[PDB]
Amino acid sequence: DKNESSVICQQLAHLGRKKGNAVLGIFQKYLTGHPKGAAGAWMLNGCLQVLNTGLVPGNRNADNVDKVMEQFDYIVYPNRSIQTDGIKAFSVTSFGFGQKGAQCIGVHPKYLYATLDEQTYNEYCTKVQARQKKAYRYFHNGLINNTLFQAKEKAPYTDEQLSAVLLNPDARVVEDKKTGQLIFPPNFM
Amino acid sequence: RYLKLDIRAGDKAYQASQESAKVLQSQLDLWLAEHGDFYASGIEPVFSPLKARVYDSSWNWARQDALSMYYDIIFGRLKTVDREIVSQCIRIMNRANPTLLEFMQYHIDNCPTDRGETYQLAKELGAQLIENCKEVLNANPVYKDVAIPTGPKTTIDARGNLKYEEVPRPSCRKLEHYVQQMAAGGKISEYTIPFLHLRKKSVMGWEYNKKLTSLYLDCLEKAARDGLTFAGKYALMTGAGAGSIGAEVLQGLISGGAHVIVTTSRYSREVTEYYQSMYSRYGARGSQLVVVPFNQGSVQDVNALVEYIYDTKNGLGWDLDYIVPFAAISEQGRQIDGIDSKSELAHRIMLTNLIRLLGAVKTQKASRGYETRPAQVILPLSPNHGTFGSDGLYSESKLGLETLFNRWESENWSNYLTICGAIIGWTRGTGLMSGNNIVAEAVEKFGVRTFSQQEMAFNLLGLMAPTIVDLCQNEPVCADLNGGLQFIPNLNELMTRERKNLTETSEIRQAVTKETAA
Amino acid sequence: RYLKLDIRAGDKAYQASQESAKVLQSQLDLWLAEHGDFYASGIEPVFSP
Amino acid sequence: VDLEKVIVVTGFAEVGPWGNSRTRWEMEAYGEFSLEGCIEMAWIMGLIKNYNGLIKGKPYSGWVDAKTGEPVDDKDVKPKYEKYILEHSGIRLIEPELFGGYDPNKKQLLHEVVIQEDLDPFQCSAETAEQFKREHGDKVEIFEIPESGEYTVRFKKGATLWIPKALRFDRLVAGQIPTGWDAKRYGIPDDIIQQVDPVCLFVLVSTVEALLSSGITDPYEFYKYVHVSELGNCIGSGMGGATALRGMHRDRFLDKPLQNDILQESFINTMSAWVNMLLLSSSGPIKTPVAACATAVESVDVGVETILEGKARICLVGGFDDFGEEGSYEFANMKATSNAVDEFAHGRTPQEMSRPTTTTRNGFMESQGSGVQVIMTAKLALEMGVPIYGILA
Amino acid sequence: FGGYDPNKKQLLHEVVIQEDLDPFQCSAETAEQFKREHGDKVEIFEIPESGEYTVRFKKGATLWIPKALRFDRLVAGQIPTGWDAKRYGIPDDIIQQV
Amino acid sequence: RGMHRDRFLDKPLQNDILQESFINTMSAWVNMLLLSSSGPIKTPVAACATAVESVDVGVETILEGKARICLVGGFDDFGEEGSYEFANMKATSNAVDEF
């Protein structure tokens, strides 16, 4: 905990983060424990939810912050959740056994949308909206019937098509209008 | 026989063991026959240094609170400078440090005022708070209370239904006005004697002393205006649970910068979270809160607590400036025929082990020669000398404490301790008096003052002010904080009558309501 | 074995009795630690019609 | 920017001590479950179910208690079951049933004893007798049961024997999947549930949940837009299937029953293979990172990487690990995990034992589960109109 | 391979106790551990001279015994016999640790 | 093996033995004693195909610019238990039948 706080402060300082501009620290393992190989995923999922809500969760087990952490001025250690007016970017870090340090940086989706034109944006809106309705519906159906998961059996192709699908990179399925399945149509070539 | 073996020997040893059992059993029987289960269980040791919780990270909570306040203004949750904001500003000021100033300055310098009135307001109020924090950066933290002094109000609705509430007093908007009212007294204290006053030992007993009273009232007036600092003071507190006077006194001490060890007879996560939340809110720069399990019924816990406080290797290594031994058990419903094992335990906690706790502190101070640091004992006395009735050995315990006044002069421990006996009057909302809250409004109409936990805590912290501590080194101080209840004849009969008066009125409206329904 | 007999059983019962002893002993210790001998002896009944 | 060289997260999920990413976020953000959260957890834990048909001859459709079949209203789920949910989710004392019987107060070890007198004989197949004779040599003595062709066997002084003993361990607490969690409720068939290691089940469901949080009901949807070569998988783990890993050494050495290809379930790649097999049919690149604690980030990296190199246009990323008797023991030997006995002496509850940055912090609490994200190019995400939760900068 | 012979592949087999066993000796701790694993078929009593303990097992507890099976994979591609990292200069401490 | 089997038989052990069971540890050792590198370290797993996966991941990482040199390839041991399970899979040749 000391080493990681030092590393983050050193990164921020040496890139010239403005004094007083401290990052809000998240410490999820107080709540979930440590699921070793899964760990970063939960942390990443939480950071995506932070981007979505503007809410930064706190470490409820942080009863007294270690005095050695006071020197890490670029970090705040919250013990309760803090609502902000939005989050632009987050960092995730990990220190695996065998000296494996790992780090990743996420940015808020608005910055991507700000690279499109308004029409392209609105068309995307349309699709995600339609899809959302379909998803909500499917979800309830699977839930009520204990069938969210539903495994495949057949390939979308057949054993003659097999190699040819493997060799025509423009091969695409269609929805079969009789079964509703997605299949490589017999004339896909 | 050829092998020199025998089975019966095993049984012989077993029989001897029966005798061991019967021997020991008899003694338990004899013990229990003179003590009772409530006593037996109430005296077991629970003190453990491993279970100590220490809170000192006020620097981190200051940044969190400053940021929370910034966003609460932005979201329009905070629109007007109310006393709650002023109180929060005082708490941030008491925690001010250079890193916090840099942190606040960054947010205010980069506040986007173009986004609306709330951002502009956040910038203006933040700049004012930054400047206030710079002014107090090198000043010691001070306890300064900005809440409104309340009074009891008991209402019966039109249907006949009772509700108790603490309401702001129309005549008292600030603690300065409160001190003025306390100094003025009431019609019931006309020869006026102030509702809060100091007594001096005379040949005929403890009498009202105008000079000492003026010193204490001046301390309270200064405390109301300028605040009280306890920076670099060490305090031992017993009886600071939720809804106690001790909890409010604890808030004052840690906000003034004290190092406080607080004791609990029930150690659990919820209790530690309560104290944690108190420290996160009220802890100042350089204050420290230590929470430990402690049973004031056990001589061993008493010894172990005092040893842990004084031990420099495995303990806190402190030296105490103050003692607030306010632990108490409710004995309500016990008359002369009902003095039980619980009354013995209550008496032991409130009198016998309190005296031992003091003796243990003396022993440490004497053994290490700290003769120029006598501790002030705020000694919790009661105006109830059996006048409430049906309260077990409570009156006897409180009267028994009064003897310490004389013992300070007649024994050889004055060099290590000094006594400040507070006669604590009726304090509303406490676990000992909550059942009487409904009649407190009626009692005040007779011209006496009842107190909120806040008001009483403010009075007590005033006894810890430097001028009073110096006085205690001259002579034991007796502080009458009773609010004039001693001038009401037959308090129990009056209380019983008013409790009836409420009930009748309530019942009549309820009967009419119920009949109207039928 | 043919007679369904055993010596060790006597010891087993005796061990249980050790536990009886230790159990009761602890309580005396706890009692005395908060009372003292002058108290203990000073509270015994002597009344006899 | 080139949208073909921007990578985005488009859906994600997890299986963990607080259920899934939603229920975990309620506890992380607010510290209590909502109505929905309580229902979801009650369903996950098998406390409740939908019914639709006749009850007691009357028609009914709606929620019922999972044991009695009595109707239940939503409003009553939280009051009726939240206490049980909180007692049987998150960081808590080890429940041995979730580990097939492992109790840290009774950790079994085997100890040797040497024979001091020729043993009383016992009976077996000729084959078993020969096997004893082969392992023990000349202290073993075998002779027919001439009536049956079985054999009876004696051991002699100077051979040896091995005997179980129990040790009390000091890691009594863990972050555990909610008690009663069952892959079957999602629709995974009983045959697969019996064949695969539990971490595979965690991964499969985290994957499907991520698909649904991406708004996709059938992975073959991709094959409208992209070629079956262009879909990759880079999910990985700290280690493979702990059941298979252990069983292959320990339990086969005790001659217990087994499904025979068990070795394959011990490999890390196998969970990724299963995801592909049953859901995807992909031809694309599949890679397998390993970094014990950091593996999920390694996966996310390798994914971004592979898409940027063009070898895939979508990847499934993230990772998993289990909790087990042996892993718990070795991380205690490393003094990496918190000592539950010491924490109890310091007056800490199981939920307080993991407390990063605090003065009194003394190690992590071990946990199990999986977490998965769906990543793809921003251009593709826009083409298919999937939601976007963040940009991987 | 530190002794592994495919003609003598070792496996462990159970046997159940049919008569109370002849006793044997150990530390108190080991005795307690037996008592903990086997429960009421295990019986422990002091060696009062030393503070060690002696232990009996009773009918109805169990025991585990090595047996050998002949396996059919007798051949492998193996590093040259006598290969040693030390000859390259790798120190004995690392050779023992990894 | 030792961590399951031999500790269950209460034999002597060096205590951090678990770490030597992880795939990444051999790569860590190469770095530790010879390289002092700060650069990226990655760990492929593909039972038989792992060396190619390594070579790929290497080429890849250099092309992405995150390294300019990489050490690539792989390993595996031969053991009692592995031999038994690949016979159960009928993947290895039967020496008795071959004789």
UniProtKB/TrEMBL annotation, chain F:
Q: Which residues form the active site?
A: 48 (for beta-ketoacyl synthase activity)
| Protein family per UniProt | Belongs to the thiolase-like superfamily. Fungal fatty acid synthetase subunit alpha family.
This protein is called Fatty acid synthase subunit alpha
